Write an enzyme that holds these catalytic residues in place. Structure first.
Site, PDB file in Angstrom:
ATOM      1  N   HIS A  62       0.802  -1.232   0.000  1.00  0.00           N
ATOM      2  CA  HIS A  62       0.000   0.000   0.000  1.00  0.00           C
ATOM      3  C   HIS A  62       0.831   1.276   0.000  1.00  0.00           C
ATOM      4  O   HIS A  62       0.351   2.321  -0.370  1.00  0.00           O
ATOM      5  CB  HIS A  62      -1.062   0.041   1.116  1.00  0.00           C
ATOM      6  CG  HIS A  62      -0.637  -0.508   2.440  1.00  0.00           C
ATOM      7  ND1 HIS A  62      -0.364   0.288   3.538  1.00  0.00           N
ATOM      8  CD2 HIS A  62      -0.563  -1.786   2.877  1.00  0.00           C
ATOM      9  CE1 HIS A  62      -0.074  -0.482   4.573  1.00  0.00           C
ATOM     10  NE2 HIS A  62      -0.185  -1.743   4.195  1.00  0.00           N
ATOM     11  N   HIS A  92       6.281   6.926   5.891  1.00  0.00           N
ATOM     12  CA  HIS A  92       5.813   6.523   4.584  1.00  0.00           C
ATOM     13  C   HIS A  92       5.143   7.719   3.960  1.00  0.00           C
ATOM     14  O   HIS A  92       4.971   8.754   4.593  1.00  0.00           O
ATOM     15  CB  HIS A  92       4.834   5.348   4.682  1.00  0.00           C
ATOM     16  CG  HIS A  92       3.612   5.705   5.458  1.00  0.00           C
ATOM     17  ND1 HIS A  92       3.543   5.579   6.819  1.00  0.00           N
ATOM     18  CD2 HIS A  92       2.461   6.292   5.070  1.00  0.00           C
ATOM     19  CE1 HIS A  92       2.385   6.055   7.245  1.00  0.00           C
ATOM     20  NE2 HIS A  92       1.710   6.504   6.202  1.00  0.00           N
ATOM     21  N   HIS A  94       1.945   9.054   0.998  1.00  0.00           N
ATOM     22  CA  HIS A  94       0.789   8.838   0.139  1.00  0.00           C
ATOM     23  C   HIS A  94       0.959   9.790  -1.026  1.00  0.00           C
ATOM     24  O   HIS A  94       1.405  10.922  -0.832  1.00  0.00           O
ATOM     25  CB  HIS A  94      -0.507   9.133   0.887  1.00  0.00           C
ATOM     26  CG  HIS A  94      -0.643   8.377   2.168  1.00  0.00           C
ATOM     27  ND1 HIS A  94      -1.334   7.202   2.256  1.00  0.00           N
ATOM     28  CD2 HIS A  94      -0.146   8.626   3.402  1.00  0.00           C
ATOM     29  CE1 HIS A  94      -1.281   6.766   3.506  1.00  0.00           C
ATOM     30  NE2 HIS A  94      -0.529   7.593   4.212  1.00  0.00           N
ATOM     31  N   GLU A 104      -3.489  13.246   1.787  1.00  0.00           N
ATOM     32  CA  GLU A 104      -4.643  12.771   2.524  1.00  0.00           C
ATOM     33  C   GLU A 104      -5.336  13.964   3.165  1.00  0.00           C
ATOM     34  O   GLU A 104      -6.510  14.229   2.906  1.00  0.00           O
ATOM     35  CB  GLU A 104      -4.186  11.728   3.537  1.00  0.00           C
ATOM     36  CG  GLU A 104      -3.619  10.524   2.841  1.00  0.00           C
ATOM     37  CD  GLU A 104      -3.759   9.273   3.616  1.00  0.00           C
ATOM     38  OE1 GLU A 104      -3.319   9.255   4.773  1.00  0.00           O
ATOM     39  OE2 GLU A 104      -4.313   8.307   3.064  1.00  0.00           O
ATOM     40  N   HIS A 117       4.100  10.908   6.216  1.00  0.00           N
ATOM     41  CA  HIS A 117       3.662  10.596   7.556  1.00  0.00           C
ATOM     42  C   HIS A 117       4.795   9.968   8.342  1.00  0.00           C
ATOM     43  O   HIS A 117       5.256   8.891   7.995  1.00  0.00           O
ATOM     44  CB  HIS A 117       2.505   9.609   7.501  1.00  0.00           C
ATOM     45  CG  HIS A 117       1.248  10.218   6.996  1.00  0.00           C
ATOM     46  ND1 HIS A 117       0.167   9.490   6.553  1.00  0.00           N
ATOM     47  CD2 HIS A 117       0.891  11.525   6.915  1.00  0.00           C
ATOM     48  CE1 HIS A 117      -0.782  10.320   6.178  1.00  0.00           C
ATOM     49  NE2 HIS A 117      -0.375  11.561   6.394  1.00  0.00           N
TER      50      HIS A 117
HETATM   51  N1  LIG Z   1      -1.353   6.554   7.237  1.00  0.00           N
HETATM   52  S1  LIG Z   1      -1.195   6.738   8.836  1.00  0.00           S
HETATM   53  O1  LIG Z   1      -2.400   7.238   9.432  1.00  0.00           O
HETATM   54  O2  LIG Z   1       0.043   7.431   9.072  1.00  0.00           O
HETATM   55  C1  LIG Z   1      -1.068   5.289   9.631  1.00  0.00           C
HETATM   56  N2  LIG Z   1      -1.849   4.230   9.306  1.00  0.00           N
HETATM   57  C2  LIG Z   1      -1.678   3.126  10.089  1.00  0.00           C
HETATM   58  C3  LIG Z   1      -2.266   1.864  10.030  1.00  0.00           C
HETATM   59  C4  LIG Z   1      -1.914   0.907  10.974  1.00  0.00           C
HETATM   60  C5  LIG Z   1      -0.998   1.196  11.986  1.00  0.00           C
HETATM   61  C6  LIG Z   1      -0.389   2.451  12.092  1.00  0.00           C
HETATM   62  C7  LIG Z   1      -0.706   3.431  11.164  1.00  0.00           C
HETATM   63  S2  LIG Z   1      -0.128   5.009  11.062  1.00  0.00           S
HETATM   64 ZN   LIG Z   2      -0.029   7.523   6.191  1.00  0.00          ZN
END
Ligand SMILES: NS(=O)(=O)c1nc2ccccc2s1
Ligand SMILES: [Zn+2]
Length: 258
Positions: A62, A92, A94, A104, A117
């Site tokens: 993803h 990571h 997006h 986002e 993020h």
């Molecule tokens: N994309 S995020 O909100 O930065 C993020 N998503 C997730 C999903 C599972 C565990 C930690 C995070 S931190």
């Molecule tokens: Zn994220």
């Protein structure tokens, strides 16, 4: 898990397996800059990444995660809206299929080309898996990317992407300094929210920096050569791996700045 960002398993479907998707503190959100109130009680953010120890980069199907050694207090986020100490575990991005989308969070409905993020967990809960079960378990530092001049501090990331093209591939990725991904100003908005990928847990204090970083078109083009699929499978370019803005509901976005 079978969720994704494809034509049939994208964000609009996630609620079927993850009903919290329609919950009261989901992320991301649109940041209405005129409605966000300056909170003089907010402290400056403390980003302490001097001892950050990156280990590996992983295509998880993803996004790609740059993972850090979080077995002790090395790279931590504190201050700002936060009580206590939050340890960096991974970052990571997006991003979009074109420069006009990818973030986002949005700012007065503006979509940026991408969003970084940096994910941190509250050390008072001992491990990440326990932290995500708490309303104040995570702090995610969000940074917008716009396309313009190259970000030199990003190039080491982009140059390794060809080695992790497909889901499940990883590569050693040591000595990467995430300070090279920060903008000049640490002015921010903050609000209580959630993870933006399943399981969408409502455990995040969001800290979204006002100032975007600039990356080059060539840099983001390389993000878009990644694949959602595994090796040997039909190629699905990893693009548009962003969840759209969710209802703000009973939440206030606070600004650290006038
Ligand atoms: N994309 S995020 O909100 O930065 C993020 N998503 C997730 C999903 C599972 C565990 C930690 C995070 S931190
Ligand atoms: Zn994220």
């Amino acid at each position: 898990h079978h969720w994704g960002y494809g034509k049939h398993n994208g964000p609009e479907h996630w609620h079927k397996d993850f009903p919290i998707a329609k919950g009261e503190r989901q992320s991301p959100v649109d940041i209405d800059t005129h409605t966000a109130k300056y909170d003089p009680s907010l402290k400056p953010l403390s980003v302490s990444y001097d001892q950050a120890t990156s280990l590996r980069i992983l295509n998880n199907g993803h996004a790609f995660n740059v993972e850090f050694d979080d077995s002790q207090d090395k790279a931590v986020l504190k201050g700002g809206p936060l009580d206590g100490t939050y340890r960096l575990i991974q970052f990571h991005f997006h991003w979009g299929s074109l420069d006009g989308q990818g973030s986002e969070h949005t700012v007065d409905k503006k979509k940026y080309a991408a969003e970084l993020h940096l994910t941190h967990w509250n050390t008072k809960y001992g491990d990440f898996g326990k932290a995500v079960q708490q309303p104040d378990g995570l702090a995610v530092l969000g940074i917008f990317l716009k396309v313009g001049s190259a970000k030199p501090g990003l190039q080491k990331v982009v140059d390794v992407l060809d080695s992790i093209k497909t889901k499940g591939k990883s590569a050693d990725f040591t000595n990467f300094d995430p300070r090279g991904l920060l903008p000049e100003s640490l002015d921010y908005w903050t609000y209580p929210g959630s993870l933006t990928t399943p399981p969408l847990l409502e455990c995040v204090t969001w800290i979204v920096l006002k100032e975007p970083i600039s990356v080059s078109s060539e840099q983001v083009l390389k993000f878009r050569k990644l694949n959602f699929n595994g090796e040997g499978e039909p190629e699905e370019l990893m693009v548009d791996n962003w969840r759209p803005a969710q209802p703000l509901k009973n939440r206030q976005i606070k600004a650290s700045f006038k």
